[PDB]
Structure formats: structure tokens, C-alpha cells
Amino acid sequence: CPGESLINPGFKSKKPAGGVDFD
Amino acid sequence: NKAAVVLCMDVGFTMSNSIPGIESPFEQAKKVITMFVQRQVFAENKDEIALVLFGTDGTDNPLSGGDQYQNITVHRHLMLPDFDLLEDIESKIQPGSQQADFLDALIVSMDVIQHETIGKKFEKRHIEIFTDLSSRFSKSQLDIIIHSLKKCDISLQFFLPFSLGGPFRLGGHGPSFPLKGITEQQKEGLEIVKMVMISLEGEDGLDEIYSFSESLRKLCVFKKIERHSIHWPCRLTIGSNLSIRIAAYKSILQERVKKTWTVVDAKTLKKEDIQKETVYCLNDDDETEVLKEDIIQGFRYGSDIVPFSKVDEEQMKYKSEGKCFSVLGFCKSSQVQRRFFMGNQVLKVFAARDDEAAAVALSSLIHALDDLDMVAIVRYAYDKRANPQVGVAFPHIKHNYECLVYVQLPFMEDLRQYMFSSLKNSKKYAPTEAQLNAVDALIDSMSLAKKDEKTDTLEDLFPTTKIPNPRFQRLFQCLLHRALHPREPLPPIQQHIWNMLNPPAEVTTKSQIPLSKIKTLFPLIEAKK
Amino acid sequence: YSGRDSLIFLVDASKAMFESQSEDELTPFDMSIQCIQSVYISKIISSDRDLLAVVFYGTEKDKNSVNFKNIYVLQELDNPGAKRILELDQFKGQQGQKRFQDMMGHGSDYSLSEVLWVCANLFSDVQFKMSHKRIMLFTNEDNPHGNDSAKASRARTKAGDLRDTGIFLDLMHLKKPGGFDISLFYRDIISIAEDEDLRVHFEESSKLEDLLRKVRAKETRKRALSRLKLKLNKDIVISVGIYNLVQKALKPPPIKLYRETNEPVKTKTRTFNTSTGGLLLPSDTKRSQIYGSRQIILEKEETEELKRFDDPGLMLMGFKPLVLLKKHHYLRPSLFVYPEESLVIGSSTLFSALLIKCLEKEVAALCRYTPRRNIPPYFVALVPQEEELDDQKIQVTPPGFQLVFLPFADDKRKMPFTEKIMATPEQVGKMKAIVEKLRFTYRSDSFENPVLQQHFRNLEALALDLMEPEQAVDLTLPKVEAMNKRLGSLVDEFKELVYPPDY
DNA sequence: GATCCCTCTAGATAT
DNA sequence: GATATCTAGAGGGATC
């Protein structure tokens, strides 16, 4: 399954926060 | 801080006329006044309440000298309301057989305000009049009344059996007392009241003329004595060189009962004889008492436990810079979904009081956000000991004020990533065209908004946001019933409470046939357990 | 619950893993050790109620209960812990390699079928009900098992019947000297949809970066808050489930424990009379409230009864257009409503029809909400929610109704009247320029709770006896320097336009 | 029947 | 310096 976390199966992987990035 | 409210309620024989199927105006006014006094007593407010009755057989007021201001009695002077007043309202007050002028009664009540306010500090002097206006009155003191009310800074409200503008239902969302039995005397009284309200305020007093049925489902009685919340001073900082002095108030904050149910002994009814304790014992068998100071803080780390003392946790704790309201950046309003709002409060951000420069700066920010259809993502921290939050500050422009509304936004950890099966793509859960048409008819029939003709404004037929919380009124009723009749069971929920909580009878009647179609087209069967 | 999660870490102990291609990189053995350390930390933070194990093959000693050769079961399937983390940290890189070589052998022959049998029986030993059976295999060669076709075929049959059982065998492309040389044994020994790893993979790492990316979250599983009944009237009733798609994550509460022996201490609270000292039954107490000089006495059942209005569920008051739902009328976080066919049949069909028609007509179902017994009701609006799929065809917004609470009359606070001071169009334009300069794209997961992050770092440092807790970076802070550089003279111009030179 | 989660009610202590 | 928020003790549901 694409976009699936390898640590906790059944839940999508969490993208890193990043914060505020000005365009 | 403290207000002086005088309830000038009619007692005359006219309001005792009970039209079949409709509760009498005397009973409706009694219910409204009981609603007001119940909150004023059980909320422990410091406002002092006086009760003036006009239309009674007897006379007792400091204005009677023989054939003037007759049939008006001052039942209660300005003092803290109590269960004595509540019992007087419930049972000891009886309808009279005489008639009195609702303007002479206003004179008497203003006299009470003026000659009992001295020696005490009152920020507000409110007064409410409950009458049906179906009595002959002398309109010769209007100028004096208006001048005295304006000079003494005394508010006004009026409550009538009919609203200003199926079966009648007290407290419901529908037509009030029918607009066909109003006599010419009532018409003259109504136009006099309209003129008085106009002269006192301007245009918005026509909104301050209520009916008992609609006042039972509104907080309008407490409108002129409600206390405004305290402000939260801070600065709205954009970058490190642009600061705007602001003041924030809580718009929506769920109200809960302040008084707590004290646990007392079933015999002596005293909390002193009953006291709790905590017991610390080992989780294994042979529970042994553990001394209070022989326990240290700990934490779970997987299958193990680690000690983490209070002082060590304080030393290693995340330390905030302090109170702040700082903009992290601006984003489109469409990117901040309403379904992601967090927290348990809503903040409205105004400029600092008596600060024209701050007002101009905040208005410029609000107008820029509104024109660009953008919102501000801000960092909010109530104090240096408060956990910082990230939220959205979207503009809110009205005809009399402008502000930024702050609602807390979620963090990464707050979101829940749940998978739900698709409904549109489902094959076994696909409604047919007949079912879709039946649901369409149901939606059309159960509409709670009416589109006004010749105007593009939608009128709400069930504005629940103006309905007070029924739990407080139910609790007050139960407490008063127990206080007055200590040896009787609690009374049932009041019919007008149920009526304001129920949808309009027009909607209920209209929703009959479509609901039958839904029942006959949707085979709902309960699964056997 | 739907079962727990089980993971087995399979690490090769061949001599070829102990060497490094270059000298500025990290050797495969301790790099995989760091991988497992990161997985343990992530599981402890997020999903501590899972099972993790580490087994080594290609060694001299053995400790597996079923007693096969050249296989060391270092850890059994059990919950992750700081003790296990430190035990595996005992083999970390420098001097870790020497301790590994001193405590277990390396370079010895091994059998893949033997290893898979060990993994299978190790899974079978634990009695817990598990949703997933996954093993991660760490190696960077395939030569030793390619010499004997008989044992290669035996290992292939072992993978086959493990796949039939439901063992989700993963492959980790580890740092190889001259390439892993896939498509001989490890391509068809694993369970894959297709040849995604069709390249030779000269690179040392494939998914190790996201294997090392730690997960600092509570990671809660799906569970319906309440299985209520949506009542159109007294006769048409459907069953729905209530879920919280957003819930404010809390710092885990501290546990009280004995000082020197360090075991949890349970707490029991008892109420007794001061005079007699004996225990009091719940019928021996009454609830009291005092107003002024009058005391009101109620039973506990009476106090619970006065809060009772309606039976639990949702009663459909009517349908109201979405334009009448004011955005600034937020009271408490919204809930999600989804149909439940396990209670009433046809609930899904009626829910789908209602959702379709509400979305078409842009109306919200106004309902009276009673979460449970003896609780006052609130008015809620069932805002229709359409399913939203991104470019990857994964679900980001579930279909259903968004149960949004509506405030009551006394939930709203009035505010002091202010003077509506208007802003000139030039000032509005200057702030427009400022806002456009500070524009950015917002996502719901763009920020992390600094308090929770710092608490997790502190807990990890204290449990692992680190020299100092590594400080979390507060992403919820204004980048003041970047903002000033981006703005420039716009702020000064706005201040000149608005603020008089006294304020 | 235990456990975990989630509101609700109640107590305290800083800013 | 009243206040609000943070933190710390009692019940109902879901799922083992």
C-alpha cells in the first residue's frame, strides 16, 4: 500500500512538520 | 458590578382573562419573573431587586395622597433576592380586581429607584414592565417620564402578551397570541410604549419590546444587567518591528454550574463529619500502607518505569518566552478548515481601548485580510506558564465594530488518521432514484429557514443560538421546588422548556408525509444480538 | 482492537558486514543497529503495546528454544523497553563490534530455512492476538545460500509457507560492496506486488532514511466514541458511530511509585465518618447545596435525575442551509458521524442518501445531541462532508457528517461597545503588500506541540541515560529575522502612514 | 472482569 | 489581585 508507515501498519506515514515556509 | 432592577408587574383583572387553549397573561408574567429571580438567586449575583405591583386592591407606595397613584403597591424594596421573594412570587401574590395606569406604576417604580438608590453604588438602574396595556391610562406625564428616565440613566424593557411582529404554544418558535384580538385601548398603549422606547434610545428599542412566550426562550431579561468579561491585554506582533496593542475577549465560552454538590452525612447533613482520605498500598497481594512522603513521581517508557521527580521535571520542562500574540504568517482562508478547530474557547481581538493608532493599524490588517480572502496563523500564549498554541485569526467585520476572531488550530499529534470505507463508491449501499427523491422531499419539507419574498435574506425559523441552556433553568426549578416543598419529589420538566427545545409545529406538521415515504422506502431492520 | 503488531528484526552476522567500503561512512552492522534503536524509540513513543524481537544468524552460539544451530535469539517477542534498547546499544559500533565478536561468533554458515523456522515458531510462541506478522531482514549479500540449490529451494518453500501463513517478510537493501545483485534469491524470497526493486541498487540505502525518521506521536487506533442512534422521528431510526478525527493530545500522567524499590503503587480512596471511623455506604451520604442561609438536600439519584432530558442519540430537528452556520460560533471540537450496519440494516443506505441530498442542497441537519444517559442535550449541526482524494488516490477526508456543536444563548459573551475607526485605502494597501509578502501555505500537520516534544525528549534521555537531552526545535515560533528580511521598508512605511510620531 | 480513552466534576496556584 | 489554565481524581463505552 502506497503512503503507508513502516513503523505502524494500517496508518499513513507522517510527513515531517516543516513549519512555516514562505513562498 | 451591581445593578438595581425593579420589576413592575401588572396585577389587574384584565390579565386574569384566560382565553381557552392559552395560558393567561398573569401566569405568563409570573413564569417570566420567576425565571428572572431564579437565576438572580441561584447565581449569587449582587444585584438588588424590587417588585412593584399595580392593579391590586390595596395601595402601598410613597406617592399616594388620595386619588392619585392608586391600586399600586410596592411588594418588595431594593434588596438581595431570596427564597422569601421566590415564595411570594409563586404563591402569595394573587391577581387583583382593580385597574391602574402603567405610567403611574412607572412613576412609582422610578421613585423607588431614585429614593432607594441613594447611599449605595449602582452601575446600572434597570427596570422591566409586565403588562397587557388593556386599561385606560392618562397620557399627561410622558414628557416628565422621558426627561427623568434620560436624566437618571435608567434603562427600560417591556413585556406584553403579544409579540410586536397552529395552536398557541408557550415558549415555542412560532406565532404568539393572535394578532386579531387586540383592542383599541391596547393599540393606544402599544403606540405609547413605542414612542417611549423611541425617545429613550433611538431605533433599536423596538427590539426591546418582548412577549412572554419569546422571553421565556431568551436571555433578554438579563441583557441590561449582564456583566462584560475582562480583557486580555497583549500586542499583535508582525516580525520584530511592527507591534499593535490589542485587547482580546472570549466570545464563545461554555458556561457550567458554579456551585458544587457538597457531600454531607445522611443524618446530620453536615460536611464536617464526613471527610475523605487517600490510601497508598502496593499493587501486589498483602496490601501495606505506604507513607505519604515515601512516594516519588514516575513515568512509563514502554514496558519499563523511570523515576522523574517534580523538581527535575520543572528544571527540564519546556520554558515559554512569555505572554505573546505573534503572527507566524498569512494563508488563504480556504486552507483553514472549520472542522480542524481545537480548544474550548473563541477569542475576539480588538484594538487597545482609547488607542486610535492601534485601532487604525488593526483595521488596516483586518481590511487587508478580508480583501485578500486570507487569514493569519498566530502563536497564542496566555502567560509564561501557559502552553503555547497555534491558531487562526480571521477577520470579522460588522456595521459597528471590527475584530479578529482567534480559534486554536491543531498540532501534528492532535490529528487522527482514520480510514473510512467510501459510501459513494459502495455497491450494496447505493440508494435508488426513488429513495433519493424521497430524501429530497424530506429535505424540502423539513427546511428550517424561510426565504423572504422581495429580499435575498434567509430568515431562521429555529435560531437555536438564542435559546438559553435548559439545564440551568431545570436545575433552578428543581432547587426551588426542593427548597419550598422539602418532602416532595422533583417536578417534571416544564412544558415551555420542552417547547423551546422542540422544532416549530409548522415544520413538524409539514414533515409528516415525507417521513412516511422514507419509512416505506427505506427497510430499516434491527440486527439481532 | 483488531489485534496487535509484531515485528522481528533479522540481522545477518557474516564477516562481510563488519567491513566498511569507505572510512567516512557507517558500517552496515551498527547502521542496522541504529535502525533498530530508532524503531524501538518510535514504537515506545507511539505504539508501545506491540511486540519487537531481534535475532541474529550466521553465528556460533545459539539460544533459540527449538534448538537449531547458528541462530541467536537475542530478544523475544515482547513490548519494547529501555532495557532492551540499552541491551542492543551494547553492540553499538566501536567496541560494539568487538563485544559482538566476543559474545557470539561470526562468519559461520547459516540456513535461511532454519532461520525462517525460528522466526515462525518464535511468532507462534506468543499467545497475543496480532494483526500483522512482519519480519525485517538485514543483509547485503546472497552468495552463501546460492551454492547449494537444495537448501536454496528449501528456503524458498519456507518463504512460501510463511507467506501462506501470513508472514510479511521484508527486505532491507543494505550497503553492499559491488551491488546487492537482486533477482536471484531475495527478489522471489520476499512478498512484493511487482519488481519495484528492479535496479541493481548500487546505493547503500533504500528506505533507511524513513526507517530512522522517528515518530513522536501518540498514534491512536480507530475506536468509535459512542454507537448512538440517529432518530429522524420516533419510528425511523438508524445507528451511527461517533469518532473524534481531532483530539488534543495530552502529556501522559505521572505514576506514583515506591521510592527505593520502584514499583507502581495503586491508589484507593475511602470515605468514613470522623466520629465512628467506619466505612460509609453510598446510601449514607446526601448531596447538599447552601444558598445564603438555606440548605438544599438532594440524593445522588435525584441530582443525576435533574440532569436527564432525553435518551442518548440524535434527534433530527430539521434541515438548515449552511450559510446560517456562522464560522465564529465555535464551541468545542467537532466529531465525525459514520453509519454502522452492525446494529441496524439499511442505516448505510439512508445515511448515503441523506449525505448525497445534503451535499446537493448545501444544507446541514440540525440535531439534538445526547451523548449518554443523564446529560443535558446540545444542538448540533450535521454538516455534510464529501470524500476527498489527493493525487495518490489515498483518503484524506472521510465521507460522512461533521457533528459540530452549536453554542447556547449563555455560551456567548457580550462585549463592550467600541468605536469603528476606519482605515484609509492607502493603509489597507500597505497592509495588503505586507500580507502578500508574508504569504505561506498552511497544512494541518505543519506544526508540532513543543511541550509534548520536549517531554518526549526528556523521557528518552532519562530512560536511556543520555549525557544531555537533545533540544527540540520550536517550529511554532515566528521567524523574525526571515520576516524582517522579507519585508524590509514596508513595515517602516506602514508605521509612518499609521502611527503618529509620538505613539 | 480489566484496560484504555474520553467527558464531566472538583480542587489549587501562578501569573 | 480575581481569574483562568494547568493539573490531577471519579464514571460510561468499546474491546478485548
Author numbering:
A (entry chain C): 180 to 202
B (entry chain B): 6 to 170, 181 to 544
C (entry chain A): 32 to 534
How does the study describe this entry?
We collected cryo-EM data of Ku bound to DNA and PAXX. (B) Cryo-EM structure of Ku70/80-DNA with the P-KBM bound to 2.8-Å resolution. Within the cryo-EM map containing PAXX, we could confidently build residues 180 to 202 of the P-KBM. Although full-length PAXX was added to the cryo-EM sample, the only density observed was that of the P-KBM, in agreement with previous studies suggesting that the P-KBM is critical for the interaction with Ku [reviewed in (11, 12)]. From the cryo-EM data, we observed no evidence for a direct interaction between the head and coiled-coil domains of PAXX (residues 1 to 144) and Ku, in agreement with the previous study that reports a similar affinity of PAXX or P-KBM for the Ku/DNA complex. The P-KBM is engaged in a groove located between the vWA of Ku70, the core of Ku, and the C-terminal arm of Ku70. This interaction is bipartite, with two clear sites of interaction on Ku. Patch 1 is formed between the N-terminal part of the P-KBM and a groove formed between the vWA domain of Ku70 and the core of Ku. Patch 2 is mediated by the C terminus of the P-KBM and two helices of Ku70 packed against the Ku core.
Nonhomologous end joining is a critical mechanism that repairs DNA double-strand breaks in human cells. Nonhomologous end joining (NHEJ) is dependent on several canonical proteins, namely, the heterodimer Ku70/80 (Ku), the large DNA-dependent protein kinase catalytic subunit (DNA-PKcs), DNA ligase IV (Lig4), x-ray repair cross-complementing protein 4 (XRCC4), and XRCC4-like factor (XLF). Following a DSB, the first NHEJ protein that binds the break site is Ku, where it rapidly recruits DNA-PKcs to form the DNA-PK complex or holoenzyme. PAXX (paralog of XRCC4 and XLF) is a more recently identified NHEJ accessory protein, which structurally resembles XRCC4 and XLF [reviewed in (11)].
